[PDB]
Design a protein around this ligand. Structure first.
Ligand SMILES: CCCCCCCCCCCCCCC(=O)OC(COC(=O)CCCCCCCCCCCC(C)C)COC(=O)CCCCCCCCCCCC(C)C
Ligand SMILES: CCCCCCCCCCCCCCC(=O)OC[C@H](COP(=O)(O)OCCN)OC(=O)CCCCCCCCCCCCCC
Ligand SMILES: CCCCCCCCCCCCCCCC(=O)OC[C@H](COP(=O)(O)OCCN)OC(=O)CCCCCCCCCCCCC
Ligand code: HEC
Ligand code: HEC
Ligand SMILES: CCCCCCCCCCCCCCCCCC(=O)OC[C@H](C)OC(=O)CCCCCCCCCCCCCCCCC
Ligand code: SF4
Ligand code: F3S
Lengths: 37, 449, 54, 175, 25, 54, 397, 147
């Protein structure tokens, strides 16, 4: 069974955006809790 | 006996269950108002008790140097054990393909959420420095300190938090199809769009149901180990300790069996009034009450087996401490708890074996109330009596509860009933789907004879 | 289409995204405040009663 | 323009229509029911749902994360002698419960969120609900919609094929 | 839409950098 | 941080001498030698609770 | 049915070979034969006790799986009276038959007179404290009483099921069996727990575990369920197992095997964490004996092969739906159950992993071969899948 | 150590790090033999109280001393339950005197004045041990011995 959104231009872009958001959040959190002191 | 009384239609199930919520505020029945007022008054008692506990400290209870754990832990275990029966009905019966879970899964699971909410306060309230509860949770700090992770209270933090989140997500997933029926029948533009956002445009259809059914089976499969693990961990803290009564190998399974047994009594006590007050007699039949009583009897016998194992362990070993534990349970200053325990959970369950007693609604209510008191007494016996007398005779003292821990107990009851009343006012008590699907399954069974 | 406009889909997805961003931002602000120089009084020349200069 | 709606009275009629469909090549169709029929479901939705792979992946990730968290926290970052308990892998008892709880938690979140996302569930607005009688679709009404995505879809022929069955109301659901 | 997600991410990044600078001001 | 890694901060006495002292480029080797000479205890002991708190 | 006869012949061959090597071991040393026999009886007893427990549990809770294996469970339960006769050699060891048959000392420490008598050369006080409860006459009487209860429940239930074929099966008989099963499940749990305590926990009187016995019931349940899956593959073609069966009973039995495997692991881990975390000298020795002289390797093998490998393999819808894959896992689980019980019983006597005798392997294979032969003899007495049953509708879904 | 009131002693909340126990055990019991035993924290190498502590307030020391950190303690009270000798005392209420200037002068600077919600136990007079350890290390470095 295909996903409902299969065959959409927006799928790769939304996945990318979610990954970029996540990476940014992770780096910022890491900096504050590990390197900011 | 059948689990569905004949003469039901998909429209009738939508209209009957749908009518309870969505009724105009000014048309709320007076019984609801009376019950909600009582629950709110007990909630005010809860607020006063918590405020004075925070102002003065945990010293207002009856706890002392030998008995460092008093009625706070007893009530925590009692409330957390109330929520096992609803999780069982929601998940294990789904795995077992039992057909009597359809009409009682929603109310039982709501009871589990509210009981977990009530029991989650005690770990913070009994803490002595309640505002430092976050220290148990791993969190980034400038100190570099960590939780021990080898104690059982660290396990409690992960078990209760996981249990609450999984129960909430499973309950919300079940409500998503029900929200879709409510938004369609809301009849007010503002009432609609509130159920509709919760429904998330469910638009029930094939290729949505197929994923929904698989996800529900997977969530039910994950929840069954989770609930057993939660109660086993709430039993490990006593078992890990070297205290003679506390360290018993049979504690984990016995505690799980006790939780289902106490929870089923609470579910029978609250479900029977809801069934009579609304026209839910067709949805919840006498067969549902009879099967629930049999499950309560089955788990009660395992609790009695746990007692027999404990007594055999006391008589088997030559340790002075096990023998004095038995003596203090039987002829000690707190023997009343043990005698009431033996009366309430062993003598009361024996009538359940007979079919006529299970069929009688008054008999079930009296036995369920006795079981609820007996389970509280069992927790009291396990904790307080064992803590009172220990290895060194010089460190022996008696535990006498004050009025403030009782005030907290009634306050938690009030909070629980307030949450139940708001739930029954706003959301449907009976799953609207999985009840018409039950009717579909029953009609198909009749066709194949 | 019954009770919602066409852009409700985008609005709901963006609301979820913004809620997650707001939770992360709140955590970050709390951590930064508790690790700030104003809170811990770092690099702040405290004025003295007699104005002694090392 | 989105599709054609059948509005069938009873689930048996919906099943019969779906069985008569998929025989003329009318693929890319859906059926709307208050409850899972389980006969319509396997007819037009057959295959892997996709949830179990995510459940397994995130459950294993959570269990590993919990174990690594306990190990790094209490045996590497700050080594603290507590009760004489070992500071090695022989401390594998008293490390199981956190691993199990983390695995269960992440598996449950993966199951729920994957079910919601794979269904494209957060859609308050849809081309459906433009049908006048779809309001009663969650309360005793059954429907069959053939999407415009179907390779052999033309408004006139699809409507006529739906009328070849006996439907209470054939509608043209638009965008 | 991806464009709005990226715009929100950039706004959140700017806010986070401002907060981080405010801490060490 | 310094109770655990004291070889990056230890200096050859003259600690009260005007703090115009700049650590040398080979701070690691000199720090290890000074840790060995002064007998600074390993992190097994310097990170105990009753070292600081009482 | 010819496959059933082949299974019976293979079981008989395994039995005669196992008894023959056990007899050769007895000639070299009587003591080694008796210690091996105790382990062999304990592992063999699981299939009949498990069959009785599942039969009563299925009567209480009607299921498609229960109707499919009801006749096979009845046949396995029916072998219980013969199992009681097999207990007689163990009884001779702890009675005054010692000093004869070549036994230097009584099989059980409580049986030895010096240990339980004041002024005795050893006179261990803890064993002496339990002398009335742990005495040869009392132990034999309780085990015999348990055998009578087990035999009566198994024979009465089988007789009612055979009667169901003749007449009055619509509500009568089915209700009667359900009622006998409900009282029986409570009697079965109490009798099995005490039987486990007397036969195995009493080997070392110094140690006692409350969870013990419940763990044996889980171990017996896994062994019987694995055995049922192996038998079902052999009887997959039998005509009544051709028009009256579907993938759903096989899938349900696979789910039950997975649940029993996780349940057994939970009970074993629960005992280990409580004893390990509460470091009390009284309960520490049992774990010390099972983690020394190579016993640690057997414990690691149980953790990996017995638990992780089945849990991952049975985590899929396929490998439980398919009978052949369910059979291969079921044979592996049975081998792991034999290893688990050897780890539970053998360290009491061997003291070293390399000290394990051929007789230790011989006694379980010979006794379980007798059990299989008797089971295959009994199951051919009556047709499978009793056609006259108000639950036959669950098989037609 | 704080002085609790008679009502607090009645509730068994007295705070004493060291206690002496009279066992009065003999034949007759009208003329028994009095036995006095002083009881204080045993500083057990394997300590049950440390294993049950969620926030790691109680951990061991390189020397072998049990370390109770008042600041870390969140007040759970699990450690007292798992202590076999029951030598741990908890501040259920604010026993310490904060409003009396003369009592504040009496308090020793080396040992912290505990607040409500923290457990207390015998610390083998850690302040004396720490002072001796610092003095021995200072003397060794000045000598250059590193002894
Ligand atoms: C001592 C520790 C005990 C650990 C207990 C482990 C067992 C609990 C497992 C959870 C249920 C998984 C069902 C999968 C599924 O839905 O299977 C379907 C078939 O569908 C598929 O093809 C695959 C589905 C994907 C499954 C992935 C699951 C994620 C990985 C697990 C991560 C675990 C955590 C801990 C890291 C059909 O199968 C079923 O649904 C049958 C369900 C049977 C319920 C088993 C109940 C467990 C009883 C023992 C529990 C003991 C206590 C101590 C926890
Ligand atoms: C409460 C906590 C622990 C639970 C432990 C047991 C594990 C339960 C989950 C596994 C489910 C297995 C798959 C489903 C199945 O095969 O059973 C369904 C069966 C038949 O149902 P039909 O398909 O025929 O539909 C009938 C109605 N339409 O339903 C049953 O009858 C239940 C089977 C019996 C359950 C056996 C568990 C016994 C628990 C023993 C506990 C021992 C404790 C020892 C200390
Ligand atoms: C090693 C061998 C195995 C030994 C196992 C021993 C332990 C077994 C315990 C079983 C307890 C069962 C209690 C009785 C429940 C009951 O009455 O059954 C009702 C049902 C529904 O069937 P219906 O409609 O009434 O009629 C069927 C015939 N038409 O069947 C069920 O089993 C589901 C009910 C819910 C199950 C409750 C038991 C859960 C036990 C949990 C505690 C476990 C402790 C570790
Ligand atoms: C032994 C493992 C411990 C434990 C359990 C704690 N510490 Fe320390 N500690 C030190 C300093 C300089 C501070 C002040 C931090 C600050 O001002 O920001 C602390 C503080 C703590 C706390 C915080 C208490 C609070 O109420 O906020 C805690 C919980 C704590 N410590 C626990 C210094 C040291 C040491 C210097 C060598 C070492 C060693 C320890 N602490 C050890 C511990
Ligand atoms: C690096 C510049 C350090 C900083 C930052 C802190 N301390 Fe320290 N400390 C340092 C050294 C090189 C030593 C000598 C260790 C030895 O065994 O000789 C110490 C020692 C202490 C001690 C005494 C240790 C003992 O065993 O008694 C104490 C009490 C101590 N340090 C306290 C302390 C505190 C509270 C600090 C944070 C404000 C701190 N030190 C920082 C080097 C450094
Ligand atoms: C519940 C989750 C945690 C929320 C914060 C709880 C503690 C906040 C607090 O106590 O602030 C006190 C601080 C000294 O007072 C302050 O420093 C001022 C606080 C500034 C804002 C910090 C919180 C922003 C929102 C946090 C959301 C998470
Ligand atoms: S507090 Fe009790 S258990 Fe802990 S070290 Fe002291 S005497 Fe031992
Ligand atoms: S359990 Fe720990 S949190 Fe404090 S009261 Fe005891 S040291």
């Amino acid at each position: 069974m295909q996903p409902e959104w299969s065959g959409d231009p927006e799928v790769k872009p939304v996945f990318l955006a979610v990954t970029l958001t996540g990476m940014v959040a992770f780096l910022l959190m890491v900096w504050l809790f590990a390197f900011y002191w | 006996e059948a689990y569905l009384l004949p003469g039901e239609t998909y429209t009738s199930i939508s209209a009957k269950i749908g009518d309870v919520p969505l009724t105009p505020p000014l048309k709320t029945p007076k019984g609801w108002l009376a019950g909600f007022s009582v629950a709110f008054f007990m909630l005010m008692i809860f607020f006063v008790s918590v405020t004075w506990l925070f102002i003065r400290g945990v010293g207002i209870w009856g706890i002392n140097i030998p008995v460092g754990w008093g009625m706070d832990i007893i009530n925590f275990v009692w409330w957390i054990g109330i929520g096992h029966a609803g999780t069982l009905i929601s998940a294990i019966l789904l795995l077992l393909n039992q057909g009597w879970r359809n009409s009682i899964n929603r109310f039982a699971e709501a009871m589990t959420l509210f009981a977990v909410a009530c029991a989650g306060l005690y770990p913070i309230l009994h803490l002595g420095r309640p505002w430092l509860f976050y220290w148990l949770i791993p969190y980034p700090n400038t100190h570099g300190m960590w939780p021990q992770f080898r104690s059982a209270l660290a396990w409690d933090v992960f078990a209760i938090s996981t249990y609450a989140t999984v129960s909430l997500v499973f309950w919300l997933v079940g409500l998503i199809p029900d929200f879709a029926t409510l938004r369609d029948r809301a009849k007010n533009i503002w009432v609609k769009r509130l159920y509709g956002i919760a429904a998330l445009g469910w638009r029930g259809s094939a290729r949505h149901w197929h994923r929904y059914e698989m996800a529900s089976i997977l969530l039910a499969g994950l929840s069954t180990p989770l609930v057993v693990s939660v109660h086993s961990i709430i039993s490990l803290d006593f078992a890990i300790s070297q205290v003679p009564g506390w360290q018993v190998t049979v504690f984990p399974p016995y505690f799980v069996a006790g939780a289902v047994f106490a929870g089923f009594a609470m579910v029978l006590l609250l479900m029977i009034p809801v069934r009579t007050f609304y026209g839910f007699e067709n949805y919840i039949t006498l067969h549902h009450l009879d099967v629930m009583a049999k499950v309560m009897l089955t788990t009660g016998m395992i609790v009695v087996y746990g007692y027999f194992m404990e007594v055999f362990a006391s008589l088997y070993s030559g340790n002075e401490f096990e023998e004095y534990l038995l003596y203090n349970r039987l002829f000690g200053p707190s023997s009343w708890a043990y005698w009431g325990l033996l009366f309430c959970n062993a003598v009361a369950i024996q009538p359940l074996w007979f079919k006529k007693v299970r069929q009688n609604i008054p008999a079930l209510l009296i036995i369920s109330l006795i079981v609820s008191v007996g389970m509280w007494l069992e927790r009291y016996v396990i904790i307080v009596i064992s803590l009172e007398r220990d290895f060194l005779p010089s460190s022996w003292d008696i535990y006498i509860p004050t009025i403030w821990d009782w005030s907290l107990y009634i306050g938690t009851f009030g909070l629980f009933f307030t949450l139940l009343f708001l739930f029954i006012r706003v959301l449907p008590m009976i799953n609207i789907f999985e009840m018409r699907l039950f009717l579909y399954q029953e009609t198909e069974k009749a066709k194949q004879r | 289409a019954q009770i919602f406009p066409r852009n409700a889909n985008l609005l709901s997805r963006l609301s979820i995204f913004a809620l997650v961003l707001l939770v992360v931002e709140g955590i970050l602000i709390l951590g930064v405040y508790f690790r700030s120089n104003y809170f811990r009084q770092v690099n702040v020349a405290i004025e003295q009663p007699v104005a002694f200069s090392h | 323009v989105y599709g054609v709606m059948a509005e069938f009275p009873t689930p048996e009629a919906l099943i019969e229509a779906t069985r008569k469909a998929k025989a003329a090549g009318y693929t890319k169709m859906d059926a709307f029911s208050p409850f899972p029929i389980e006969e319509v479901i396997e007819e037009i939705a057959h295959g892997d749902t996709g949830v179990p792979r995510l459940v397994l992946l995130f459950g294993l990730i959570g269990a590993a994360s919990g174990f690594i968290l306990q190990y790094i926290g209490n045996l590497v970052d700050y080594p603290l002698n507590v009760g004489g308990r070992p500071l090695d892998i022989t401390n594998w008892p008293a490390m199981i419960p956190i691993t199990f709880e983390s695995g269960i938690l992440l598996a449950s979140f993966a199951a729920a969120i994957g079910m919601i996302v794979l269904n494209g569930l957060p859609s308050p607005y849809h081309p459906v609900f433009n049908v006048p009688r779809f309001q009663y679709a969650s309360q005793d009404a059954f429907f069959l919609c053939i999407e415009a995505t179907d390779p052999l879809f033309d408004r006139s022929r699809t409507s006529q094929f739906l009328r070849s069955l006996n439907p209470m109301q054939v509608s043209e659901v638009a965008y | 839409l991806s464009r709005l997600m990226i715009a929100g991410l950039m706004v959140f990044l700017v806010l986070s950098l401002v907060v981080l600078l405010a801490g060490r001001l | 941080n310094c109770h655990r890694n004291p070889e990056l901060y230890v200096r050859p006495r003259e600690e009260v001498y005007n703090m115009d002292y700049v650590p040398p480029s080979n701070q690691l080797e000199i720090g290890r030698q000074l840790v060995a000479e002064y007998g600074i205890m390993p992190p097994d002991q310097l990170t105990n609770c009753y070292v600081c708190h009482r | 049915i010819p496959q059933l006869g082949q299974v019976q012949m293979l079981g008989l061959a395994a039995a005669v070979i196992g008894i023959g090597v056990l007899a050769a071991g007895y000639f070299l040393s009587p003591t080694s034969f008796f210690e091996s026999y105790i382990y062999g009886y304990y592992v063999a007893m699981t299939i009949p006790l498990g069959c009785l427990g599942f039969l009563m549990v299925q009567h209480l809770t009607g299921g498609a799986w229960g109707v499919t294996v009801r006749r096979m469970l009845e046949a396995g339960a029916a072998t219980l009276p013969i199992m009681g006769l097999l207990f007689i050699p163990i009884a001779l060891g702890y009675f005054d038959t010692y000093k004869a048959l070549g036994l230097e000392h009584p099989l059980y420490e409580w049986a030895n007179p010096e240990v339980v008598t004041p002024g005795g050369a050893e006179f261990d006080p803890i064993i002496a404290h339990k002398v009335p409860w742990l005495s040869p006459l009392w132990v034999t009487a309780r085990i015999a009483i348990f055998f009578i209860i087990w035999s009566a429940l198994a024979l009465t239930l089988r007789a009612w099921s055979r009667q169901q074929d003749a007449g009055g099966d619509a509500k009568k008989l089915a209700t009667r069996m359900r009622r006998l099963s409900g009282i029986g499940v409570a009697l079965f749990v109490i009798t099995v727990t005490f039987f486990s305590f007397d036969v195995a926990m009493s080997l070392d009187p110094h140690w006692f575990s409350t969870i013990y016995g419940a763990h044996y019931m889980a171990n017996a349940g896994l062994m019987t369920l694995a055995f049922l899956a192996l038998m079902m593959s052999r009887v997959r073609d039998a005509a009544l197992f051709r028009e009256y069966v579907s993938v759903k009973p096989i899938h349900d039995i696979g789910k039950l095997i997975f649940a029993f495997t996780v349940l057994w692991t939970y009970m074993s881990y629960g005992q280990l964490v409580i004893i390990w975390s509460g470091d009390v000298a009284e309960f520490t020795p049992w774990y010390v004996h099972r983690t020394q002289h190579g016993w640690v390797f057997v414990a690691l093998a149980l953790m990996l092969f017995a638990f992780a490998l089945p849990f991952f393999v049975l985590l899929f819808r396929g490998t439980k739906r398919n009978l052949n894959t369910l059979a291969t896992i079921a044979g592996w689980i049975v081998v792991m159950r034999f290893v688990d019980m050897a780890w539970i019983i053998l360290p009491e006597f061997r003291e070293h992993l390399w000290d394990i005798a051929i007789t230790d392997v011989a006694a379980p294979i010979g006794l379980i071969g007798l059990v299989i032969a008797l089971f295959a003899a009994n199951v051919q007495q009556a047709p499978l899948l009793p056609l006259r049953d108000p639950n036959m509708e669950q098989l037609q879904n | 150590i704080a002085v609790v009131g008679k009502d607090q002693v009645s509730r068994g909340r007295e705070m004493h790090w060291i206690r002496i126990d009279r066992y009065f055990a003999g034949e007759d019991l009208d003329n028994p033999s009095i036995y006095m035993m002083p009881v204080n924290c045993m500083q057990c190498e394997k300590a049950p109280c440390e294993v049950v502590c969620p926030v790691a307030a109680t951990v061991h020391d390189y020397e072998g001393l049990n370390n109770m950190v008042y600041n870390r303690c969140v007040g759970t009270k699990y450690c007292s339950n798992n202590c076999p000798y029951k030598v741990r005392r908890f501040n259920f209420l604010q026993y310490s005197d904060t409003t009396t200037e003369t009592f504040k002068l009496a308090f020793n600077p080396d040992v912290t004045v505990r607040i409500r919600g923290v457990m207390e136990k015998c610390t083998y007079c850690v302040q004396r041990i720490s002072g001796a350890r610092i003095a021995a290390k200072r003397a060794a470095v000045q000598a250059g011995q590193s002894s």
